């Protein structure tokens, strides 16, 4: 017979078990890819020529990691991202908006530099003694006997018996003795130690500021450089989010704050954090050191579920395709991890070392793109929609009603897209929350709306640069036709397919109160 | 306390839904289930018919088992006189449909005056025309000439609504023994359950009657004793080209009609569960199975289904119904019947207006008590093979109406089709269907929730203006009828352009 | 064609289930819904009662709104004579329960005067004076109506509605006198003698349990009745009053609260908690509240009783036309079927058996409709939903019941055999709604009679002495159930049944479940 595209046979299952049993490797996914791809920029991906290829390969958001680098460095990276992005601007039908994200240092603890003498890294051997010092005379003279770190109040928050993790939690030490300003430890889990490695104190109430003087400088720079969003590190409570918001101030009021959940306190206080934030990142690197690694999937699924329920963006991050730093193909676990994040409901997925420093940045981007489309088709939309509807049923909001009606109609007629005209993005955000399988082409004259729309599953932002037409009906038609041309050019649909179109009836309509089923011309 | 059983609406399971049903949760003003009333001596006057309309009658049923063409022509005239007496007010005028219910392949006795048949007593059944008007305790004439070729020894014969039963002892005559006795009058109905009755689907009389229906511009035919698709097509062929727009509603009232239901449904415009004859032809204890199966399959198909017969039977003589009758009406609405019907209760009873009024009250209560969220999900699942664009518009619109608790869906339609597709997905809110087609308006009563409104205004030159005119009319109707007030929200379905072939445009609109 | 609506049973959705219902899918022999019959002039002879038992009657209801203790004692005697006429064969013997239905706080009119017509016509718009003067208690007419509620004027106001004769006549209070009410007829009709009066707007202050009710309840204790149907229960305290009157001697008599007024519906949860079971008393309920709302109360009450695992009875006018006709109306067929689908443990007959021309036909029709509707239940969904509702409980017998019912669905078992003395284990199985009959073998005769309150429990009395070896005593009782099932045509050799027993004499419940072939 005919093998339906986009796992549509599985779509019709009555139970989740039957849905899984019907998944078919010979069911081709659609062309559109709904899951946003966020790429960390670094030495491997920094050039204008590489960035153009990154955009072509699927990058939607460029992440600048302020744990390292000067303002000069980051300004140059941002410049290059914008040069690459605008190189495509001559064709408004094919131009893709690209967002810029600033990821804060936050309250990090780091070691110093390994001493010049001897091997490049020192071996910390199981059972050996290691003294932790705060004496700056050692800040560039760390070795197998004495380790300097930059957290001055460390002795006030740890106890005898405390565990100290170093280098992505790979080395572990146990505190044996406390001095006034030093710690005598025993190496519990040994390994080779390099310079400026991350330190975690999972047992401790670390008392560094949520927003340091450095972070304030960095956030202010972000406002000056017109970044679209901030990924705020180590958010523990709503008050931390409010602090970031206050620093961004009036000038930065439209910059979106994505709180990174990466410690136990952030998980415990998740609901209040979500309420205060514009979205969330599941920051799995630190999270899986701060809590037992075998528990991370619980936090990931809980956080993604709760964000989906709230209609707020959620990003899955860290080690998704880690082996691709050195290899041109991912492991089977990595393929599975990306697919399952998409199935979980992540709006965006992220690359870190894979794009920042790795040997195969373009291949990493391309692989996220391929896996995302497969997993998107494999979602159980009918059930997901019912469950989202149930969760939000206390709300009688009119835009939610239009969004739900439009998504339902899109399922029924297998629409090739939903076209949404929006200035603030809000109407498109509501459609995205209800998880259509078809792409959402959001036409906007607001350039920042376009860049920020990448935070939401399925929104394909399109910037309209045409002046406003005097007649509302003509201005609406102009923008709808732009989406039709974009969709055709991108291969999302062709003449004779059907799309759902959401518009405002009048210029003063406060949301898209008008839904049409329209054939593609 | 939330109105309209909205607390129960939010339940996760069917059991929790039932547990939340609340006698103190008031229904809405709108009543979605169509009410079909049989017209007879108790209800035939223009004066009574006006009160019938005011009380909620949507369809007037003329039963052609009895009465001359002259008689029925006069009844039809009176229905139209009563209906048109309200025509000058476009905001309150209610269209009223006219339905012709055929005699069909009935078996009937002759003329007796009454006769007592007692248990054990012998009764001879004859076909000799010399006894047509000479029926008594010993000799009964009936009009089915082939009865002997079709019954066997031991076969049961039911007379007078299945109340009298006879068992054939020997076989142009039949000698029988009276089992269930009783007083027998003239020209009573006869049933032969489990016999293959070979009377024509459409008799010479039925042909005359159907041609009369075309002449009289009836809206629909209720075709008696439909056994198969071919029977429906025989009716359709008589109605012919001139009658092509008359809706054919097949009556399921025998075993074969139930067995061959799917082909009958395909061939028909809608269905009636004709429970009177059905409950004689099959064991009475099985009728609810047939009722639920038929209503479910009609709902699945989006074709009108009517529940009929003895729904409020005791109201022929009493001003209040029994508890079983209240339950029956509620449960038919819960099952999903588009329309419910009255027969003797309105045709000959002492309390016709009270019967109509009671159907109205029960329907509103039961409509609120449906489990719309689950019903919609299940209807969507059943029709998922279809990608129809109007179905998509309908489902999106109904979904939106649930989400924002819209007070109505307004649908602009000429053929009715867009409104029919909204009705099939079972919104809780009323569907105000504005049409310039008067026959569309009358026929719309076959569908749950459609409140038809005739627009008599000239067509405006500008499409947007003509659309607004019709939407405004619906707003005025809804306000006047107490369905909504300024500030409420409604879902509005229109065509984007005059050329659009369905309502491809949906809006959420505040009531002005 | 699959029997027992088993094709419909496999549906994924409620709509699909309905679409699959098949008139050619034969029900099983067993009938699970209990049948309660009101005994009266048409049904109180020993010979008729034997036929009523044969036709399916499980509980004989004595209506104490009428009749003397002498009368009811004679009826009870006859019920027992008929019941025990079958006792010589323990394989076929059917236990029959006796229920006492109280008068409660009724209001009734007096006798129509001797002169003039038998009934008087109360015409719309006409005046009618209500009096409490006993000089008129047997002299009621179209001008003056006596009634027996001495405090009526205290609870009614000008404008109040007064309903008479099953709510068929209505009056509006126009003037209040010290001991009288001037009314205007609103809904007219013909008025006979000793007709029921309802005051839906009023806080009627008659005692829940009158001096007469106390005498009647004590009489019920002395006569060893199995259950009491307590009229007009408005609150938990009313139930406690009845319980106190029954006292220590009557502590094992089951109290079924009749819900028949607005307050009873409002205070339903506390009433259910205090009661052993519930009756939806639809006659009075549909006068006290708008008749069009009764189905809401019925479905809510049945649902909540099902969730609690407490017996619920649907009552009143189920087959009303059969008082005079040998066949019911289509609405009546529908009503019975829908009560069973709703989840009623028992269904009831009133005038149909007490005074009608066709009492046996009425019982037989309830039997036929019940079996058809039982098969048409959506058991898979019902079980899921009941399990969901009770999931806060981790009770061990509930776990055995759910496991046993689940197993019964999976292997299409022909019965669940349950060995029980108190009935508790069988009651928990019934609560989870298997499609197969529950054959409950008990040595406690009162347990057997009371088991009729629960859907699907087919009680069987074991009269054999206790065997010394527990395993042999268990086998003896299982074998009795096997013999009963075979004799009744529930199953034959080679079919499969689920058997629930205690592992040892001291097990407090049936902690042992087996899948067993019928020998
Ligand atoms: K960082
Ligand atoms: K007819
Ligand atoms: K009583
Ligand atoms: Mn981190
Ligand atoms: Mn018929
Ligand atoms: Mn009562
Ligand atoms: Na070194
Ligand atoms: Na918007
Ligand atoms: Na249309
Ligand atoms: Na008299
Ligand atoms: Na027990």
User: Which string of DSSP letters, residue by residue, matches A198-267?
Assistant: EEE-TTS---S-SS-HHHHHHHHHHHHTT-SEEEETT--SHHHHHHHHHHHTTTTTTSEEEEEE-SHHHH
Measured in angstroms, the CA of C15 and the nearest CA of chain B are apart by 6
Whether A99 and A121 share a structural domain: no
Strand pairing partners for C303? none
DSSP B66: S
Q: Which of B265, B262, B269, B199 is nearest to B239 (CA)?
A: B269
CA distances from B150 to A241, B50, B122, B145, C237 (A): 87, 47, 21, 10, 66
Residues A12 and A86 in one domain: no
What does the DSSP 8-state code read for residue C312? E
Rounded distance from Cα C183 to ligand 10 centre (Å): 22
Give the pair of three-digit tokens for residue C336. Answer: 């019975």
Closest partner CB to A405 (pick from B388, B400, B505)? B400
Class of residue C260 by CB neighbours under 10 A (exposed 0-12, middle 13-18, buried 19+): buried
Are both A387 and A479 inside the same structural domain? Answer: yes
Stretch 390-409 of chain A: residues touching chain B, C-beta under 8 Å:
390, 393, 396-398, 400-402, 404-406, 408-409
Return the residue in A401, A402, A505 with the most chain B beta carbons within 10 A, the one to mutate for interface testing. A401
C-alpha–C-alpha distance, residues C106 and A372, integer Å: 73
Domain termination site, one of A357, A375, A393: A375
CATH number for position A251: 3.20.20.60
> In this structure, are residues A123 and A171 in contact, taking their beta carbons and an 8 Å threshold?
no
> Which regions of A274-387 does DSSP assign to beta strands (E)?
279-283, 314-317, 348-351
Instruction: Specify whether A110 is catalytic.
Output: yes
Instruction: Examine the residue annotation and report whether C304 is marked as an active-site residue of this protein.
Output: no
Q: Which ligand is nearest to the CA of A260?
A: 4
Question: Which residues lie below 8 Å from residue C498, measured CB to CB, with a gap of 6+?
Answer: C404, C407, C408, C413, C415, C416, C417, C436, C513, C514, C515, C516
Q: How many domains does chain B have?
A: 3
- Best of B7, B326, B351, B364 to mutate (most C CBs within 10 Å, chain C): B326
Cα B422 to averaged position of ligand 9 atoms, centre (Å): 11
CB-CB under 8 Å, A398 with B508: yes
- Supply the Cα-derived Rg of chain B in whole angstroms: 24
CB contact under 8 A, A409 and B388: no
Distance from CA of C393 to the nearest CA of B (A): 17
Which DSSP symbol is given to B100?
E
Active site (annotated) includes residue C258:
yes
C443 lies in the same domain as C485? yes
Q: Specify the pairing of strand B122-126 against strand B173-180.
A: antiparallel
Residue span of the structural domain in which B124 resides: 105-200
> Per the CB < 8 Å rule, is B388 touching A12?
no
- Greatest alpha-carbon span in chain A: 79
Q: Which residues of B are catalytic?
A: 61, 108, 251, 309
- Cβ C292–B162 below 8 Å, yes or no? no
Annotated binding site of B for K(+): 63, 65, 101-102
Q: Closest-lying ligand to the alpha carbon of C284? A: 6
In this structure, the number of other CB atoms found within 10 A of the CB of residue A395 comes to 11
Partners of residue B507 in chain A, C-beta under 8 Å: 505, 513-515
Question: Inter-chain contact C18–B292, Cβ cutoff 8 Å?
Answer: yes
| Tokens of residue C29, six digits | 């022999």
- Chain B CB contacts of A408 under 8 Å are 392, 395-396, 399
* Inter-axis angle of helices B352-369 and B323-335, nearest 10: 50
CB contact under 8 A, A515 and B396: yes
State the CATH number of the domain containing residue B372: 3.40.1380.20
Contact residues, chain C, for B19 at CB < 8 Å: 300, 303-304, 307
Measure the CA–CA gap between A265 and A167, rounded to whole angstroms.
21
User: In terms of Cα–Cα distance, which of A445, A382, A371 is closest to A92?
Assistant: A445
Place of tokens 């010290």: C178
Give the span between the Cα atoms of B246 and B248, in whole angstroms: 6
CB C419 within 8 A of CB C478: yes
Distance between CA atoms of C227 and B68, rounded to whole angstroms? 60
Does B6 reach chain A within 8 Å, measured CB to CB?
A: no
Q: Both B22 and B46 in a single domain?
A: no
SS3 of residue C34 by DSSP: strand
- Residue B460's nearest CA partner among B447, B472, B477, B449 is B472
For tokens 């705060």, what's the residue?
A134
Query: Is B476 in the A-facing interface, judged by CB distances under 8 Å?
Result: no
Q: Is C291 on the interface with B (CB under 8 A)?
A: yes
Q: Which helix (H) or strand (E) holds A101?
A: strand A99-103
Residue among A235, A242, A241 at smallest CA distance from A261 = A235
Distance CA A356, CA A325 (A): 9
Domain at B158, CATH number: 2.40.33.10
* Final residue of a structural domain among A375, A393, A417: A375
**Which three-class secondary structure state does DSSP give residue C1?**
coil
Query: In terms of Cα–Cα distance, which of C314, C324, C415, C416 is closest to C366?
Result: C314
User: Distance (Å) from the C-alpha of residue C1 to the closest C-alpha of chain B?
Assistant: 12
Whether residues C262 and B23 touch (CB distance < 8 A) is answered with: yes
Active-site residue (options: A163, A236, A260, A437): A260
Contacts of A75 (CB under 8 A, 6+ apart): A221, A225
Q: Is A228 in contact with A99 (CB distance < 8 Å)? A: yes
Q: Closest Cα partner for A520 from A489, A490, A485?
A: A485
Separation of B274 CA from ligand 5 center, angstroms?
Answer: 6
The β-bridge partners of B139 are B124
The whole-angstrom separation of Cα C84 and Cα C79 is 9
CA distance to A258, C139, C467, C519, per residue, from C503 (Å): 61, 69, 15, 21
* Residue C22 near residue C8, CB atoms below 8 Å: yes
Q: Which two tokens stand for residue B410?
A: 């307004």
Are A99 and A83 contained in the same domain? yes
For B63-96, b/e burial (b = at least 16 CB within 10 A) is bbeeeeeeebeebbebbbebbeeeeeeeeebbbb
Q: Which of A156, A175, A209 is the last residue of a domain?
A: A209
Q: Give kind and range of the element (H or E) at residue B166.
A: strand B164-170
Q: Does any CB of chain C come closer than 8 Å to the CB of residue B9? A: no
Alpha helices in C115-182, H assignment, sequence order: 152-155
Q: Does B35 touch chain C (CB under 8 A)?
A: no
Alpha helices in B171-311 (DSSP H): 204-215, 229-239, 255-259, 261-267, 275-281, 287-301
Interatomic CA distance for residues C456 and C414, integer angstroms: 12
Let me know if A253 is a catalytic residue.
no
This PDB structure is determined at a resolution in Å of 1.6
Residues 6+ apart with CB under 8 A from C451: C95, C423, C426, C427, C440, C442, C457, C459
**Closest-CA distance of chain B to residue C37, Å:** 17
Task: Please report, to the nearest 10 degrees, the dihedral formed by the alpha carbons of residues A158, A163, A166, A169 taken in order.
Answer: -130
Structure-solving method: X-ray
Residue C23 sits in the same domain as residue C79: no
Asked if residues B493 and B503 have their Cβ atoms less than 8 Å apart, the reply is yes
Residues C77 and C221 in one domain: yes
Q: Which two tokens stand for residue B39?
A: 């017209």
Closest CA to C82 of C105, C55, C51: C51
Report how far ligand 4's centroid is from the alpha carbon of A64 (Å): 13
| Spatial CA neighbour of A328 closest among A356, A363, A295, A279 | A363
* Order of strands across the sheet that contains C512-517: C457-461, C438-442, C416-419, C496-501, C512-517
Q: What angle do CA A268, A273, A275 make, to 5 degrees?
A: 125
C116 Cβ neighbours under 8 A, 6+ residues apart: C141
Report chain breaks in chain A, C–N > 2.5 Å, as residues after which they occur. Answer: none
A214 alpha carbon – ligand 7 mean position (Å)? 29
B400 contacts on A by Cβ (under 8 Å): 401-402, 404-405
Q: In angstroms, what CA-CA distances link A362 with A368, C20, C274, C467? A: 10, 56, 72, 84
Return residues 498-517 of A near B (CB < 8 Å): 498, 505, 513-517
A342 and A389 fall within a common domain = no
Q: Which of C14, C318, C372 sits opposite B14 (nearest CB)?
A: C14
Mark whether B38 and B133 lie in a shared domain. Answer: no
Cβ atoms of A295 and A263 within 8 Å: the answer is no
- If you search the block for the tokens 């972000």, which residue do you land on? A222
Among residues C108, C113, C161, C364, the one annotated as catalytic is C108
Q: Which of C14, C318, C336 has the CB atom closest to B378's CB atom?
A: C14
Kind and range of the H or E run holding B149: none
| C320 has a chain B CB within 8 A of its CB | yes
Same domain, C388 and C478: yes
Identify whether the C-beta of residue A11 lies closer than 8 Å to the C-beta of residue A324: no
Q: B420 with B378, same domain? A: yes
């Amino acid at each position: 017979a005919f093998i339906q595209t986009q796992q549509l046979h599985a779509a019709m299952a009555d139970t989740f078990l039957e849905h899984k049993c019907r998944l078919d490797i010979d069911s081709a996914p659609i062309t559109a890819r709904n899951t946003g791809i966020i790429c960390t920029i670094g030495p491997a991906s920094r050039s204008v020529e590489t960035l153009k290829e990154m955009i072509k390969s699927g990058m939607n958001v460029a992440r600048m990691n302020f744990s390292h680098g000067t303002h000069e460095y980051h300004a140059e990276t941002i410049k290059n991202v914008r040069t690459a992005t605008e190189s495509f601007a001559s064709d408004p039908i094919l131009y893709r908006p690209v967002a810029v994200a600033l990821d804060t240092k936050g309250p990090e603890i780091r070691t110093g530099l390994i001493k010049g003498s001897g091997t490049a890294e020192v071996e910390l051997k199981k059972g050996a003694t290691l003294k932790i010092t705060l004496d700056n005379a050692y800040m560039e003279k760390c070795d197998e006997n004495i380790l300097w770190l930059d957290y001055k109040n460390i002795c006030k928050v740890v106890d005898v018996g405390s565990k100290v993790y170093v280098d992505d939690g790979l080395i572990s030490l146990q505190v044996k003795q406390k001095g006034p300003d030093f710690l005598v430890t025993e190496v519990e889990n040994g390994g080779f130690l390099g310079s400026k490695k991350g330190v975690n104190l999972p047992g401790a109430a670390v008392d560094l500021p949520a927003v340091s003087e450095k972070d304030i400088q960095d956030l202010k720079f972000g406002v000056e450089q017109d970044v679209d969003m901030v990924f705020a590190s180590f958010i523990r409570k709503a008050a931390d989010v409010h602090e970031v918001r206050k620093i961004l101030g009036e000038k930065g009021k439209n910059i979106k704050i994505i709180s990174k959940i990466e410690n136990h306190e952030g998980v415990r206080r998740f609901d209040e954090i979500l309420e205060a934030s514009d979205g969330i990142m599941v920051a799995r690197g630190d999270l899986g050191i701060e809590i037992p690694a075998e528990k991370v999937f619980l936090a990931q699924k809980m956080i993604i579920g709760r964000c989906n329920r709230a209609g707020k963006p959620v990003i899955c991050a860290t080690q998704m395709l880690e082996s691709m730093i050195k290899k041109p193909r991912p492991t089977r676990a990595e393929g599975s991890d990306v697919a399952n994040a998409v199935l979980d409901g992540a709006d965006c997925i992220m690359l870190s070392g894979e794009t920042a420093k790795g040997d195969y940045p373009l291949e990493a981007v391309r692989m996220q793109h391929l896996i995302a489309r497969e997993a998107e088709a494999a979602m159980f939309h009918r059930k997901l929609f019912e469950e989202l509807a149930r969760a939000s049923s206390q709300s009688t909001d009119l835009m939610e009603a239009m969004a739900m009606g439009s998504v339902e109609a899109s399922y029924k007629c297998l629409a090739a897209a939903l076209i949404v005209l929006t200035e603030s993005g809000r109407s498109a955000h509501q459609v995205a929350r209800y998880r259509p399988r078809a792409p959402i082409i959001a036409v906007t004259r607001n350039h920042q709306t376009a860049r920020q729309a990448h935070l939401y599953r399925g929104i394909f932002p399109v910037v309209c640069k045409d002046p406003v037409q005097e007649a509302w009906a003509e201005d609406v038609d102009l923008r709808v036709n732009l989406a039709m041309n974009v969709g055709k050019a991108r291969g999302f649909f062709k003449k004779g397919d059907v799309v759902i179109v959401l518009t405002g009836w009048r210029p003063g309509s406060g949301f898209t109160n008008t839904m049409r089923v329209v054939p593609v011309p």
